[PDB]
Design a protein around this ligand. Structure first.
Ligand SMILES: Nc1nc2c(ncn2[C@@H]2O[C@H](COP(=O)(O)OP(=O)(O)OP(=O)(O)O)[C@@H](O)[C@H]2O)c(=O)[nH]1
Ligand SMILES: Nc1nc2c(ncn2[C@@H]2O[C@H](COP(=O)(O)OP(=O)(O)OP(=O)(O)O)[C@@H](O)[C@H]2O)c(=O)[nH]1
Ligand SMILES: Nc1ncnc2c1ncn2[C@@H]1O[C@H](COP(=O)(O)OP(=O)(O)OP(=O)(O)O)[C@@H](O)[C@H]1O
Ligand SMILES: Nc1ncnc2c1ncn2[C@@H]1O[C@H](COP(=O)(O)OP(=O)(O)OP(=O)(O)O)[C@@H](O)[C@H]1O
Ligand SMILES: [Zn+2]
Ligand SMILES: [Zn+2]
Lengths: 611, 468, 191, 470
């Protein structure tokens, strides 16, 4: 997710495109990446398969999958191209674009410090938890009978416009096997797929009705786009972009499918026999998915109240494959119209982010961080109109806009195992292929309107998802009065000062180095610490990608000139002392395969076995 | 007291011009699309500085000047105007027309005296007058205190200065181009800030220099030649091109103005002289020379030049009339470009790689949209030559560290001389040369003859016949 | 002269195919043709035709070249004069010249003429088909200064004609100035 | 307030303010001089000296220009013979200034100075309380304070003795530092004042601050003839301050590196001391006090205190087409040296050292507004400095890998010791350097090289210029 996940896969790429070998900033030109067209070959597969049988040590098998997957990719292109005959177009001359590059970052040396006995590391971590979090360290006294306790008490829900069968509401637990954790953090296990959990998750009541597409709604949207184009964008690209539309093209589909992996291509291939046309695919029908992981934050709140259940609304598989070739062009056009001091995390890597903010943040500087998650976007219909107006200005072809618009109105969801039907009104968060883009556009628009001209005169601004940071801005009564037109809790704002109250961004800390004198971003150690106290399901063999992720994260923590700063940042955020010992404990855990085995224990089986 | 210059209001030369003259304030005003605007702005400001510095109660001599531009002046000028060029008849006619036109209106600048003095010289073309003269700098017999040279390259310098000294001249000035490139014995060069290019006659048919012209119909084998040249060395004749105007020059007379710090003049009388540089801006210099009777001190015979920006000289390969040859060129580089290439030149770099870096630094640099490098700092037609020089310079610097030798000793096998293809003078660096510092040749080029024709006298007199 | 919609060509190549002033027809190809006379020579002649937008003007080379006067020259006959020549105004092909005469002989002459280029000047050799036969000859034109400056980066390597054509088309719509971006506004003719 | 002809946004202003914390300094630029930095320091030095001197005494000036001492409220006796090729110009300027202001300024005896000048011009060999035409030895005048401003052409012990017998008890000296010449270097530079100096034998170098060469093809073998086989510094050195050339001698330069205490013995005996009071990146101000009689004892040691980094290394260059080697010295800012301690703990190649130095010079340390990303140090000494650090790190590693016993020395019954290599000398900030010199002088010379001084054509012009005095 964004920077890096627990398995070190992340959402960002790993190729630098914003690096230069000169001590000054240089403007360059954006180019295109050529893609190899797949080709079909059956005679090679037949002979290789027979040659696979006679001798295959290690690389002989790999040639078979590469040949087999390559055949599947060619077949998908041939079938997919025929469906969208009424929307296919050709290549028109492109509009050139330019971008700015920055010099490479400088880092301080790192020294490794670790203990020897792995059991002592567990004792230190347990001592740290008890001293700082007394209630959390005394919760576990028996096994994990959460499923049984949830069945004993009844079902409480707050639904709206839903139907279900009462005869299928039964929640007797099934077999559950896991490994007993060693760290005394009480991280819950993922929930079981039952009808009771589905109703508990859908306990949200956002029933609000306003003017759908009337005159007052249009007036608010018209003002919003005016502020965005006046305080956050330059005027050198609008007229050129309107002349050249964006349409579905063979190159878009060929490039997209080639980027998929093995298993993903096979899954898509299985749904190409009865291929519906593009105009036949419904755009307002979704399916319900439950398989998720619970989210826990440092503190003592999960030992008193049960956490919520996460859900996913999945769209049609063919809908996200026909039109997913226009995401790259939309990103390029958006980056071209933004001001040089306004940045977006799309199409960057970890190193590029460090080089941009290398010489901007210094001690004693005020930074404003604001999130917009706590806001009901379903109350006002103008939030959807504003996004469409921005999309139309960017140069989206007219019939394609109708297909996109159909997914932002009335939608329905269904649960296949139980046949449960749900209906929702205007919704912004979903599982479609424009979710981050629309959220980023709305985040910039909200900030631009509230801050007015204070956004233009700034040193560095970064926007991604629902989080943002703006340099050199404080909190005054003018923004409170402007934002209090409807209510007061639209957004949450926090004031931060470098080297005194470290700013928080995307689950990390922004710190200023001492030896070199440059800014850098590091991860959150407490978030990792609670995560090692999560039970591991039996039969899982993913205990090697996590060790490498921990090893990389530990090295970044032990850089010289950042030990003292990290201590103060954690204390000013969570009011906790003594994290250097925890970091040392993490170092010895991620040193060998056998040292990582001390975080687990004997296997415990519940609700299973007729003995 | 602002000064108005005839250049564009958005030219990048304003910043350089203002920095060279911090005692004034420069204001732009354009009235003519001249192709040599930069070259005329410097000369206009140079005269203003000189005039206010000197005593306004002395007499000033002009050597080869145009009297038309000295009319509206509150000082006293003695113009020495011989007839040895095709431009003199036009200047003399313009002077007469302006004097008659502005008669009776501006009665403050002594117009009547100038009109009467000009008529007297026309009647008898051998008299010496306070305002006008018709002899040369040697044959003139007028006594004054200050002598001024402006863009004069046709007079031997030690000889002219001595003849001025014996008439009681204690101060002198000289305004013109820098003579440093001619001391290194180069074949071609350029002054990109002023749109000036010069070359020798033997390379006038080159292909990739600033002043040349070649042909296209070609492609054959074998050109019989009687003489076996095998020699390419600079000759006396040198051609200059400022904007769209051509000026022939000679190397010997150009090198005579690269005077040392201290020198002696010996003859019937003896004097000691000193030379100093006051203003320097990308090619133009202003020199001040003082004379004093007697002999004092001792000389050393050394000339020193201070570089504010990079000076470069390299060796290039080109085709002259179809035959491949090699010769040396020189140019100037801005200081900001030189500083930013310090880290790149630490290793060996391919010439094509250096060219790409130079292009980005020149026209693709941005900081905040306010100043940048004005998106054009160095003219684009000299980049390929510069890129070649840096690549060779870096390569030759690495070989030095691989041939480490002992301290205070030299090895003879009887010693080997290495090869040098690039001379690079970085900013804040000085160069020293050896010249002559003792002159005693009292030559007498005294063959006096008038150069005034009867039809020209009639026209000048007729223009002054009518007082309006 | 692209800026003034003016094209000129020699009389011997009026039946070309891919120049500004030509006209040809469709042929199927005749292997071998009769030739009463022999050629083997293709050099410019004295006849030149001009087309200023829509009007035709015949010209001569000798009289055209007589107006490219040097800086200083002498006119000596029954009477003698000394005169000069200067250029005051120049804009993409049109120039204004000033000449001043004066009686008598003065100075020395060198016989050189100097032209200052504010725009790029090109002269290349191209292959065309004149009346069904393949020949080669030279053409010349003017290029805007902005295009030339932006073209310096890639000319340090070997570039195929197809690659150069694509970049010229793209560079004809957008340029970079002072760290910012705008349209060219000084475009060149596509033909 | 004191006004200096310096650019309003120069980096030298901060350093100048720290050296003079008793004044307030403001910039006012009226001339684009190439040696503005060198002139500002001298102007402030004179103000400091006049602030701690009793205004009742008289001050001698050795080799001074009378033009710049006119509008002063103190008493000066100018001693100036005619031995330089720029002296007659100074005398003419002095006469012109006096005549141009005869009744406008009533500061002091302007008419008296005019009368004094006329008396000296009438008869040359005369003594006047304002003007003189003798040397520092032949002059006969009583005073209390003597000032030497940029004097490098006289012997220090000899000149001081002759001033002491006349009753002078306090002296001052303003000029360049002497330490680089005590190390017997071949070339050097002062980057802050744009000054480069080099030996006469290496004037045809290629990559130093003061040289000039030409292109050659590489002819292998020219001559054998005279066998040089040796390259050592000579007594002739050339200076270049911005754009002016100055020839100097090594013997006279090294004679001003006086010890802390020394004795002057002769017909009369004196004891005296030397001390440095002001130091700023190359310029120093020295104060000397003398007293009759012989007291104490001497040791013969000179000590200098380094506030910046002093570097001396061995370099390889090509002089007139032939490869040679010699030593070069320079100065380094303190901030650069401090930020380099961590890197020098290992073995670093010269290529890496160049890259870090460039990055530190532009991005780190230095910044600003509008005028942004200035340079802390000049870029034409970066290649030389980078190589010096590389050799220093290598030499510090061999010392730890080859240990010796405590309190003993290892020899080789013939016994001898081996000498190691040394290619770099580096003096870090807050470090002292000590040298051994002579502190007992008892031999003096009294020549009579003063025939006439002036000439008749110059005297007539001066009288004519002063003739129009009313
Ligand atoms: N090499 C050389 N340069 C000259 C000479 N005379 C003038 N120049 C320079 O030419 C530059 C352009 O001035 P011009 O275009 O000649 O016009 P002008 O000097 O105002 O007057 P004219 O001499 O009548 O042309 C001047 O700034 C001079 O520095 C010369 O005799 N030789
Ligand atoms: N090595 C050396 N430096 C000198 C000498 N005299 C002056 N300087 C320095 O030259 C610098 C600039 O002075 P200049 O302008 O060149 O000499 P000037 O023409 O006599 O005028 P001043 O500035 O008053 O000295 C001064 O700061 C001195 O430190 C000298 O005799 N030898
Ligand atoms: N000995 C002299 N004394 C005074 N003026 C002179 C002298 N010689 C030439 N001039 C003047 O210098 C100017 C330049 O003319 P010059 O004699 O050099 O011939 P040119 O070929 O026209 O110019 P140039 O050779 O400098 O290119 C003329 O106006 C001339 O009157
Ligand atoms: N013995 C002396 N006493 C007083 N002044 C002296 C003496 N010798 C030289 N000077 C003064 O030194 C000044 C210039 O120095 P010098 O006489 O050595 O001439 P120089 O050739 O310029 O040498 P340098 O460049 O080292 O000064 C002159 O003004 C001169 O009056
Ligand atoms: Zn005269
Ligand atoms: Zn005296």
């Amino acid at each position: 997710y964004i920077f890096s996940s627990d398995t070190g896969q992340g959402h960002l790429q790993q190729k630098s495109v914003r690096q230069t070998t000169l001590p000054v900033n240089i403007v360059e030109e954006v180019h295109e990446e050529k893609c190899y067209p797949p080709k079909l070959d059956e005679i090679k597969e037949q002979l290789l398969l027979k040659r696979l049988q006679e001798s295959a040590s290690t690389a002989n098998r790999s040639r078979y999958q590469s040949r087999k997957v390559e055949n599947m990719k060619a077949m998908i292109i041939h079938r997919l191209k025929e469906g969208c005959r009424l929307y296919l177009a050709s290549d028109t001359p492109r509009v050139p674009s330019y971008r700015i590059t920055y010099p490479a970052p400088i880092y301080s040396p790192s020294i490794n410090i670790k203990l020897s006995n792995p059991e002592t590391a567990v004792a230190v971590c347990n001592e740290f938890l008890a001293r700082n979090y007394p209630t959390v360290a005394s919760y576990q006294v028996t096994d994990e009978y959460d499923a049984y306790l949830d069945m004993v008490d009844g079902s409480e829900s707050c639904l709206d416009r839903a139907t279900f069968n009462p005869s299928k509401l039964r929640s007797y637990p099934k077999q559950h096997s896991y490994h007993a954790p060693t760290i005394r953090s009480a991280v819950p296990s993922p929930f079981q797929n039952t009808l009771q959990n589905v109703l508990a998750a859908a306990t949200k009541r956002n029933c609000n009705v306003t003017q759908m597409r009337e005159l007052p709604t249009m007036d608010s949207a018209a003002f919003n786009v005016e502020c965005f184009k006046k305080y956050a964008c330059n005027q050198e690209y609008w007229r050129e972009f309107a002349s050249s539309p964006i349409r579905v093209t063979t190159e878009n589909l060929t490039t997209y499918v080639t980027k998929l992996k093995g298993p993903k291509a096979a899954a898509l291939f299985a749904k190409t026999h009865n291929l519906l046309p593009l105009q036949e695919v419904p755009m307002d029908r979704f399916t319900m998915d439950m398989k998720r992981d619970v989210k826990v934050t440092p503190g003592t709140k999960h030992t008193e109240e049960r956490p919520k259940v996460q859900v996913i609304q999945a769209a049609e598989p063919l809908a996200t494959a026909y039109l997913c070739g226009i995401h790259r062009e939309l990103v390029r056009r958006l980056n071209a119209v933004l001001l040089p001091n306004v940045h977006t995390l799309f199409d960057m890597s970890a190193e590029d982010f460090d080089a941009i903010i290398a010489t901007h943040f210094k001690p004693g500087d005020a930074v404003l961080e604001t999130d917009i998650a706590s806001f009901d976007k379903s109350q006002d219909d103008s939030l959807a109109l504003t996004a469409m107006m921005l999309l139309e200005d960017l140069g989206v072809d007219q019939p394609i806009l109708d297909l996109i618009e159909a997914a932002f109105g009335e939608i329905s969801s269904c649960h296949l195992p139980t046949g449960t039907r749900f209906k929702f009104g205007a919704m912004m968060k979903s599982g479609m292929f424009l979710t981050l883009f629309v959220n980023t556009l709305l985040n910039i628009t909200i900030a631009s309107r509230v801050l007015e001209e204070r956004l233009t005169t700034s040193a560095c601004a970064a926007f991604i998802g629902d989080d943002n940071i703006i340099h050199g801005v404080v909190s005054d009564a003018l923004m409170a009065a402007r934002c209090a037109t409807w209510m007061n809790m639209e957004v949450k704002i926090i004031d931060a000062v470098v080297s005194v109250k470290a700013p928080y961004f995307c689950g990390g800390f922004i710190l200023h180095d001492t030896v070199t004198g440059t800014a850098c971003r590091v991860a959150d150690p407490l978030k990792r610490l609670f995560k090692l106290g999560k039970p591991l399901a039996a039969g899982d063999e993913q205990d090697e990608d996590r060790r490498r992720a921990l090893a990389d994260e530990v090295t970044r923590w032990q850089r010289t000139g950042l030990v003292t700063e990290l201590e103060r940042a954690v204390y000013s955020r969570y009011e906790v002392q003594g994290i250097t010992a925890v970091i040392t404990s993490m170092a010895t855990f991620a040193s060998s395969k056998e040292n990582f085995k001390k975080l687990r224990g004997p296997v415990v089986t519940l609700y299973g076995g007729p003995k | 007291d602002p000064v108005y210059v005839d250049i564009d209001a958005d030219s990048a030369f304003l910043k350089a011009l203002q920095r060279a003259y911090p005692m004034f304030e420069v204001e732009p005003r354009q009235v003519t699309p001249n192709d040599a605007a930069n070259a005329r702005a410097f000369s206009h400001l140079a005269i203003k500085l000189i005039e206010q510095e000197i005593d306004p109660d002395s007499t000033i001599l002009d050597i080869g000047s145009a009297p038309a531009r000295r009319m509206m002046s509150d000082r006293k000028y003695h113009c020495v105007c011989p007839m040895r060029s095709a431009e003199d008849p036009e200047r003399l006619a313009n002077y007469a027309r302006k004097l008659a036109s502005a008669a009776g209106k501006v009665l403050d600048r002594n117009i009547s005296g100038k009109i009467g003095d000009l008529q007297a010289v026309m009647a008898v073309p051998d008299t010496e007058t306070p305002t006008f003269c018709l002899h040369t700098d040697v044959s003139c017999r007028q006594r004054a205190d200050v002598a001024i040279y402006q863009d004069v390259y046709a007079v031997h310098a030690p000889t002219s200065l001595y003849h001025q000294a014996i008439k009681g001249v204690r101060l002198a000035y000289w305004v013109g181009f820098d003579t440093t490139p001619f001391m290194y014995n180069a074949m071609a060069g350029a002054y990109p800030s002023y749109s000036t290019n010069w070359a020798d006659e033997q390379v006038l048919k080159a292909k990739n220099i600033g002043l040349c012209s070649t042909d296209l119909t070609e492609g054959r084998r074998g050109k019989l030649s009687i003489m076996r040249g095998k020699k390419l060395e600079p000759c006396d004749r040198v051609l200059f091109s400022v904007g769209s105007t051509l000026y022939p020059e000679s190397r010997k007379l150009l090198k005579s103005w690269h005077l040392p710090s201290v020198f002696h003049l010996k003859g019937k009388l003896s004097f000691t002289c000193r030379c100093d540089t006051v203003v320097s801006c990308e090619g133009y210099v202003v020199k001040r020379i003082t004379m004093s009777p007697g002999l004092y001190g001792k000389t050393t015979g050394y000339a020193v030049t201070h570089h504010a920006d990079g000076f470069l000289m390299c060796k290039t390969t080109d085709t002259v009339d179809g035959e491949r040859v090699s010769f040396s060129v020189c140019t100037y580089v801005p200081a900001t470009i030189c500083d930013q290439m310090t880290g790149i030149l630490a290793t060996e770099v391919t010439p094509e790689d250096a060219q790409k870096l130079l292009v980005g630094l020149n026209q693709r640099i941005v900081v905040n949209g306010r100043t940048q490098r004005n998106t054009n700092t160095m003219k684009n037609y000299m980049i390929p030559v510069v890129a070649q020089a840096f690549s060779k310079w870096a390569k030759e610097c690495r070989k030095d560290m691989e041939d480490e030798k002992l301290l205070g000793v030299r090895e003879r096998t009887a010693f080997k001389k290495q090869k040098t293809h690039t001379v690079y003078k970085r900013p804040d660096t000085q160069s020293i040369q050896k010249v002559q510092a003792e002159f005693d040749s009292f030559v007498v080029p005294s063959l006096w003859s008038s150069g005034l024709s009867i039809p020209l006298r009639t026209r000048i007199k007729w223009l002054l016949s009518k007082v309006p």
